[PDB]
Ligand binder design. Sequence first.
Ligand SMILES: [Mg+2]
Ligand SMILES: [Mg+2]
Ligand SMILES: [Mg+2]
Ligand SMILES: [Mg+2]
Ligand SMILES: [Mg+2]
Ligand SMILES: [Mg+2]
Ligand SMILES: [Mg+2]
Ligand SMILES: [Mg+2]
Ligand SMILES: [Mg+2]
Ligand SMILES: [Mg+2]
Ligand SMILES: [Mg+2]
Ligand SMILES: [Mg+2]
Ligand SMILES: [Mg+2]
Ligand SMILES: [Mg+2]
Ligand SMILES: [Mg+2]
Ligand SMILES: [Mg+2]
Ligand SMILES: [Mg+2]
Ligand SMILES: [Mg+2]
Ligand SMILES: [Mg+2]
Ligand SMILES: [Mg+2]
Ligand SMILES: [Mg+2]
Ligand SMILES: [Mg+2]
Ligand SMILES: [Mg+2]
Ligand SMILES: [Mg+2]
Ligand SMILES: [Mg+2]
Ligand SMILES: [Mg+2]
Ligand SMILES: [Mg+2]
Ligand SMILES: [Mg+2]
Ligand SMILES: [Mg+2]
Ligand SMILES: [Mg+2]
Ligand SMILES: [Mg+2]
Ligand SMILES: [Mg+2]
Ligand SMILES: [Mg+2]
Ligand SMILES: [Mg+2]
Ligand SMILES: [Mg+2]
Ligand SMILES: [Mg+2]
Ligand SMILES: [Mg+2]
Ligand SMILES: [Mg+2]
Ligand SMILES: [Mg+2]
Ligand SMILES: [Mg+2]
Ligand SMILES: [Mg+2]
Ligand SMILES: [Mg+2]
Ligand SMILES: [Mg+2]
Ligand SMILES: [Mg+2]
Ligand SMILES: [Mg+2]
Ligand SMILES: [Mg+2]
Ligand SMILES: [Mg+2]
Ligand SMILES: [Mg+2]
Ligand SMILES: [Mg+2]
Ligand SMILES: [Mg+2]
Ligand SMILES: [Mg+2]
Ligand SMILES: [Mg+2]
Ligand SMILES: [Mg+2]
Ligand SMILES: [Mg+2]
Ligand SMILES: [Mg+2]
Ligand SMILES: [Mg+2]
Ligand SMILES: [Mg+2]
Ligand SMILES: [Mg+2]
Ligand SMILES: [Mg+2]
Ligand SMILES: [Mg+2]
Ligand SMILES: [Mg+2]
Ligand SMILES: [Mg+2]
Ligand SMILES: [Mg+2]
Ligand SMILES: [Mg+2]
Ligand SMILES: [Mg+2]
Ligand SMILES: [Mg+2]
Ligand SMILES: [Mg+2]
Ligand SMILES: [Mg+2]
Ligand SMILES: [Mg+2]
Ligand SMILES: [Mg+2]
Ligand SMILES: [Mg+2]
Ligand SMILES: [Mg+2]
Ligand SMILES: [Mg+2]
Ligand SMILES: [Mg+2]
Ligand SMILES: [Mg+2]
Ligand SMILES: [Mg+2]
Ligand SMILES: [Mg+2]
Ligand SMILES: [Mg+2]
Ligand SMILES: [Mg+2]
Ligand SMILES: [Mg+2]
Ligand SMILES: [Mg+2]
Ligand SMILES: [Mg+2]
Ligand SMILES: [Mg+2]
Ligand SMILES: [Mg+2]
Ligand SMILES: [Mg+2]
Ligand SMILES: [Mg+2]
Ligand SMILES: [Mg+2]
Ligand SMILES: [Mg+2]
Ligand SMILES: [Mg+2]
Ligand SMILES: [Mg+2]
Ligand SMILES: [Mg+2]
Ligand SMILES: [Mg+2]
Ligand SMILES: [Mg+2]
Ligand SMILES: [Mg+2]
Ligand SMILES: [Mg+2]
Ligand SMILES: [Zn+2]
Lengths: 126, 50, 206, 119, 70, 87
Amino acid sequence: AKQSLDVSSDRRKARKAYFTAPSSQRRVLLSAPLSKELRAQYGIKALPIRRDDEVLVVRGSKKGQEGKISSVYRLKFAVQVDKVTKEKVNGASVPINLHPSKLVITKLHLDKDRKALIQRKGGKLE
Amino acid sequence: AAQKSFRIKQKMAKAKKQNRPLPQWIRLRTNNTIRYNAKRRNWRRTKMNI
Amino acid sequence: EKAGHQTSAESWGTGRAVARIPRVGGGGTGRSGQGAFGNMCRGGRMFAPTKTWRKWNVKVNHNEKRYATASAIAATAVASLVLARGHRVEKIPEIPLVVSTDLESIQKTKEAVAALKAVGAHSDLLKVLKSKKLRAGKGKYRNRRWTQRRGPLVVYAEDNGIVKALRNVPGVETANVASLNLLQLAPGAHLGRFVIWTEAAFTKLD
Amino acid sequence: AGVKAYELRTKSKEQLASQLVDLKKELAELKVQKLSRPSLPKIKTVRKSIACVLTVINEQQREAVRQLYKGKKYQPKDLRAKKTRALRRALTKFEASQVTEKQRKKQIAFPQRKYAIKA
Amino acid sequence: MKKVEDGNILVFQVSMKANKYQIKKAVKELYEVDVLKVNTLVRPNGTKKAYVRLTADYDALDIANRIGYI
Amino acid sequence: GKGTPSFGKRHNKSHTLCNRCGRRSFHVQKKTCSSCGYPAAKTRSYNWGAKAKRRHTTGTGRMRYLKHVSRRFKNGFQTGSASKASA
RNA sequence: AAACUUUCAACAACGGAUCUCUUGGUUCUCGCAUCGAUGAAGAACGCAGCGAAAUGCGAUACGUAAUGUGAAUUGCAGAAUUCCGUGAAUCAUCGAAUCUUUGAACGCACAUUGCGCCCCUUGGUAUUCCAGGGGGCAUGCCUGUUUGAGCGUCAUUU
RNA sequence: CGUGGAGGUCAGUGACGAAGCCUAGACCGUAAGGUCGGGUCGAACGGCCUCUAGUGCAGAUCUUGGUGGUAGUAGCAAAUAUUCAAAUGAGAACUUUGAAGACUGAAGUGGGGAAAGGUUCCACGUCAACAGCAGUUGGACGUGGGUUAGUCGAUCCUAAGAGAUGGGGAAGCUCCGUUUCAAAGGCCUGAUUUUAUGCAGGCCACCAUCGAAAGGGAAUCCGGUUAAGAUUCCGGAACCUGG
RNA sequence: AUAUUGGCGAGAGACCGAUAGCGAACAAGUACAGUGAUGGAAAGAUGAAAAGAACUUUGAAAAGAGAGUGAAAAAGUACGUGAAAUUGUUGAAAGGGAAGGGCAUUUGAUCAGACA
Ligand SMILES: [Mg+2]
Ligand SMILES: [Mg+2]
Ligand SMILES: [Mg+2]
Ligand SMILES: [Mg+2]
Ligand SMILES: [Mg+2]
Ligand SMILES: [Mg+2]
Ligand SMILES: [Mg+2]
Ligand SMILES: [Mg+2]
Ligand SMILES: [Mg+2]
Ligand SMILES: [Mg+2]
Ligand SMILES: [Mg+2]
Ligand SMILES: [Mg+2]
Ligand SMILES: [Mg+2]
Ligand SMILES: [Mg+2]
Ligand SMILES: [Mg+2]
Ligand SMILES: [Mg+2]
Ligand SMILES: [Mg+2]
Ligand SMILES: [Mg+2]
Ligand SMILES: [Mg+2]
Ligand SMILES: [Mg+2]
Ligand SMILES: [Mg+2]
Ligand SMILES: [Mg+2]
Ligand SMILES: [Mg+2]
Ligand SMILES: [Mg+2]
Ligand SMILES: [Mg+2]
Ligand SMILES: [Mg+2]
Ligand SMILES: [Mg+2]
Ligand SMILES: [Mg+2]
Ligand SMILES: [Mg+2]
Ligand SMILES: [Mg+2]
Ligand SMILES: [Mg+2]
Ligand SMILES: [Mg+2]
Ligand SMILES: [Mg+2]
Ligand SMILES: [Mg+2]
Ligand SMILES: [Mg+2]
Ligand SMILES: [Mg+2]
Ligand SMILES: [Mg+2]
Ligand SMILES: [Mg+2]
Ligand SMILES: [Mg+2]
Ligand SMILES: [Mg+2]
Ligand SMILES: [Mg+2]
Ligand SMILES: [Mg+2]
Ligand SMILES: [Mg+2]
Ligand SMILES: [Mg+2]
Ligand SMILES: [Mg+2]
Ligand SMILES: [Mg+2]
Ligand SMILES: [Mg+2]
Ligand SMILES: [Mg+2]
Ligand SMILES: [Mg+2]
Ligand SMILES: [Mg+2]
Ligand SMILES: [Mg+2]
Ligand SMILES: [Mg+2]
Ligand SMILES: [Mg+2]
Ligand SMILES: [Mg+2]
Ligand SMILES: [Mg+2]
Ligand SMILES: [Mg+2]
Ligand SMILES: [Mg+2]
Ligand SMILES: [Mg+2]
Ligand SMILES: [Mg+2]
Ligand SMILES: [Mg+2]
Ligand SMILES: [Mg+2]
Ligand SMILES: [Mg+2]
Ligand SMILES: [Mg+2]
Ligand SMILES: [Mg+2]
Ligand SMILES: [Mg+2]
Ligand SMILES: [Mg+2]
Ligand SMILES: [Mg+2]
Ligand SMILES: [Mg+2]
Ligand SMILES: [Mg+2]
Ligand SMILES: [Mg+2]
Ligand SMILES: [Mg+2]
Ligand SMILES: [Mg+2]
Ligand SMILES: [Mg+2]
Ligand SMILES: [Mg+2]
Ligand SMILES: [Mg+2]
Ligand SMILES: [Mg+2]
Ligand SMILES: [Mg+2]
Ligand SMILES: [Mg+2]
Ligand SMILES: [Mg+2]
Ligand SMILES: [Mg+2]
Ligand SMILES: [Mg+2]
Ligand SMILES: [Mg+2]
Ligand SMILES: [Mg+2]
Ligand SMILES: [Mg+2]
Ligand SMILES: [Mg+2]
Ligand SMILES: [Mg+2]
Ligand SMILES: [Mg+2]
Ligand SMILES: [Mg+2]
Ligand SMILES: [Mg+2]
Ligand SMILES: [Mg+2]
Ligand SMILES: [Mg+2]
Ligand SMILES: [Mg+2]
Ligand SMILES: [Mg+2]
Ligand SMILES: [Mg+2]
Ligand SMILES: [Mg+2]
Ligand SMILES: [Zn+2]
């Protein structure tokens, strides 16, 4: 149970700050858990997903499929993986939108700042 | 009319500019909700009280 | 309390083939002409608007309040009552159920669930948990979304961990003897709460 | 692209005046283009750049004056703190800490003592 | 464009805050041209239009597609 | 004749635009605004006209300056600039 | 006997009840004290590569500066040098700026983009006319500064 | 008996289909009502003991919405009037062009303006709505273009009148007064040849200001030109004010 | 210490659930009316995802018929469910100046239960 006085269980208040969250917050909301491998590898459970990362869909209909995240569609609360798409009837192609809580991260894209984050959660890296 | 003050002409000017159809591309934006311009005005349907 | 009444509407009076409720004046907008104020009017003020000075709380005579909490304590023995009340207590040693004072010093949830188990709670503990349902009401979206049974009521004499250690297991409630609450001793006014007393707590009683 | 502020501020006064001109010719010419081309978003970045230069030219002229008024009664009103109109007319700490000869004598002689009960 | 070709006349949309004097000078200065006279009007979208006539030495058409339109 | 053939002669403005509120409530012969009071130094308003007030109080507008006073209050009316750090 | 009328039903109309939703409303409670001549609240007109609005902003115009973040923005186009970086972003923060025409609104006016005066400076052969750039000129009142008025009135000249 | 919400409980029902809706199918109750089947549906919901109220509709010339009979009915009949052919077009009584027949009859159905509108002007495209038949047409719809001045107006002046100011009333929003019991202001040049402008005369005491696109008032004409501007552009020939 | 239907920031409810709740859950003090003061609405919901229907055919076109997408088009930007008045079609019946109703039975249609 909540115990603080600056946290609220109000459902209306919650649903508002979800849907009206600014991009910067949507970055963190949109997180994916690392793969079982990478979790040992880095001593860390999850991460705000970031573009050129490598990922495995572990839930849903494209379950099993993998690829590179090609954009983070923050506006849409959605992530698009370069390799997982819809072929149409006019055989034109269209990104399927995936939810990072349904990916598993398989190869991080690393910056100084990325490594710096991993270290701030008190993780390790290879 | 027909020999106006610059203030009235100005207003008339601004009103010309607002007197166009919804720009169709907006219809395509995510969550777009506007279907048409619902503030359109026609000179023989509603006078613009100056 | 300004609602329904933010119009300058008049009656048109009779002679106009039309009812005598007040009506919104002016024109050009379709609101105008329409019934105003009346409780049977769309947009009207309601009949007898609710008011905050309605009496919300209620006084009970302190002594009678005791007569009740006392009564409710008395029925926490009396296994039939407890049994009849929800409360899975067929397979518990005896009633009142009194458990070692050492309980009050347990720091850690898992240790606490383990304890309660051992002394017989298990089947009641599973009755919460197996019973979480989505509230049927409109209540479900007024910060009351889920629903569920009541667990046992662990009563202690001194809190040395026990509250924080149980505070997160579904259904269970703790109480310091010195207090002891009617709302908890007889939930929904049905007598027979399954109480687990610590020794210290059981003795402070007298 | 787009000019960067931190690189602008090293540039001399009369280099920024000239860039501002270059950028203006630039902008002028894009505008001639924009009416042939079916889109011209390059023009955005050039007029955001002019902003930047002006900002900086005004920036440095201000912190010039700001200092040759530093530490003296009376400095241009628009270098003075803004605060709030009221806040502005509130007494200064000095004017408020102010105390009567007679009062202070008393404050000294009998000040509020620290004390405690028990024994 | 017809005024440019046939009239030795540059047409510019020009600042509202600006008069015949300021228009004339700014054309002179921004374009290395001599100006005969300047006629203005206010378009019905609230923008100033300047019919700028160059003197006989200059050729607005050249001068037109040297600033780069056509 | 009091009806429509007299409506025919309705072509002269009693009010033009109010410079202060822009509302076509500037009584030409009276030279004052029936809505906002101009040129009276004070703005016209009345406690029997609440909807009227509500139609015009602060915050029905841009609040160009008042917008930011409570931010400025929150940060104790800081002067000077923000420093720097890392990553 | 059709047609027609009426009743029931199935499918299909009309219409939008009902059920389930809720980034809204209402009411309670706690904490807090900050508008303006340093031009407020309010108005008008503008500003985007492609916008009529809503939101935002002011000719530096859906924004400039700074700071934190650490890679988007996205309807389409776009940049491409911005991704181990004084660095993406319709991000957050915000301490620095820009802030048209106005408004208590202040040179005079104002159903007018109407009409003066002063200073500095630039062009036209110009202290004097014209033009461009910048900077100024409301009212009551307080302290003070200077210039003054009155046989109100003191002394002092020869 | 039935509704919305609340405490307890049945470890109640449910995406293997909750709720809702439909159904001259079934069953229980004297009745309020309750239960089931089938169809439709798509995310929630109920039994029991208690608690609670914005709790049960046929009416109120009730409120708001929706819908009928009336009825393919009243009607679409003032302003003399239309016709042949071609072109176009899916489509022509109605558009374009030609022909013909007429009308308004310069007190106009002509040619322009004021007030008011504000883009209706003009071109191109073009018929879903609108133009109470129609529509290929439009003052509609889409997309563009277009309003050029020293001399035309405004701007200046004063009219009825409005209205600041020293003031006088008024608790006060404000009311009175307009040269009124006010120390009300500015021109011409001289004195400068430290120098830019102090003093030297002499005057003049008029005391705001707004208020006319028909009153007063400095000055421009003809010819040509555009899809749409013209005493405004071009051509030529003038005139006024200031310097 | 007291006040507070304003302002900034928070935590809540046996509260309302789109004709309710503030007038406004939406480009709502908007659109629209009025010379003016002022008056002042209607209007939320495809689906997980536009996958928003390629292609063929009839048509001047809008569309229709196919195909296709989808868990479902008995979800087609008229979009969740989709009642009622009222309507079209189909099927069955009845009808000599209204219709509907009560007790009762014939006739048609339709159906539960119980037999063993
Ligand atoms: Mg983290
Ligand atoms: Mg999603
Ligand atoms: Mg009309
Ligand atoms: Mg009207
Ligand atoms: Mg009341
Ligand atoms: Mg009637
Ligand atoms: Mg109401
Ligand atoms: Mg319900
Ligand atoms: Mg339940
Ligand atoms: Mg930038
Ligand atoms: Mg100061
Ligand atoms: Mg030539
Ligand atoms: Mg002109
Ligand atoms: Mg009328
Ligand atoms: Mg009048
Ligand atoms: Mg008056
Ligand atoms: Mg004023
Ligand atoms: Mg059917
Ligand atoms: Mg509902
Ligand atoms: Mg939902
Ligand atoms: Mg609330
Ligand atoms: Mg609280
Ligand atoms: Mg106001
Ligand atoms: Mg925007
Ligand atoms: Mg952009
Ligand atoms: Mg940095
Ligand atoms: Mg921002
Ligand atoms: Mg500026
Ligand atoms: Mg003034
Ligand atoms: Mg001015
Ligand atoms: Mg100036
Ligand atoms: Mg003095
Ligand atoms: Mg003196
Ligand atoms: Mg009951
Ligand atoms: Mg109930
Ligand atoms: Mg209720
Ligand atoms: Mg029926
Ligand atoms: Mg049965
Ligand atoms: Mg079924
Ligand atoms: Mg069902
Ligand atoms: Mg659903
Ligand atoms: Mg009850
Ligand atoms: Mg009631
Ligand atoms: Mg009844
Ligand atoms: Mg009824
Ligand atoms: Mg009755
Ligand atoms: Mg009724
Ligand atoms: Mg009706
Ligand atoms: Mg018909
Ligand atoms: Mg007929
Ligand atoms: Mg008739
Ligand atoms: Mg005729
Ligand atoms: Mg005809
Ligand atoms: Mg003909
Ligand atoms: Mg005749
Ligand atoms: Mg005659
Ligand atoms: Mg005619
Ligand atoms: Mg004409
Ligand atoms: Mg008009
Ligand atoms: Mg146009
Ligand atoms: Mg036309
Ligand atoms: Mg048609
Ligand atoms: Mg029409
Ligand atoms: Mg018609
Ligand atoms: Mg038709
Ligand atoms: Mg058009
Ligand atoms: Mg003249
Ligand atoms: Mg003038
Ligand atoms: Mg007066
Ligand atoms: Mg005048
Ligand atoms: Mg005149
Ligand atoms: Mg005249
Ligand atoms: Mg001519
Ligand atoms: Mg032309
Ligand atoms: Mg013409
Ligand atoms: Mg000429
Ligand atoms: Mg001369
Ligand atoms: Mg409050
Ligand atoms: Mg609370
Ligand atoms: Mg409502
Ligand atoms: Mg209700
Ligand atoms: Mg309403
Ligand atoms: Mg909503
Ligand atoms: Mg509407
Ligand atoms: Mg829905
Ligand atoms: Mg709906
Ligand atoms: Mg949706
Ligand atoms: Mg089809
Ligand atoms: Mg399924
Ligand atoms: Mg379905
Ligand atoms: Mg559906
Ligand atoms: Mg479709
Ligand atoms: Mg539907
Ligand atoms: Mg039958
Ligand atoms: Mg019978
Ligand atoms: Zn006003």
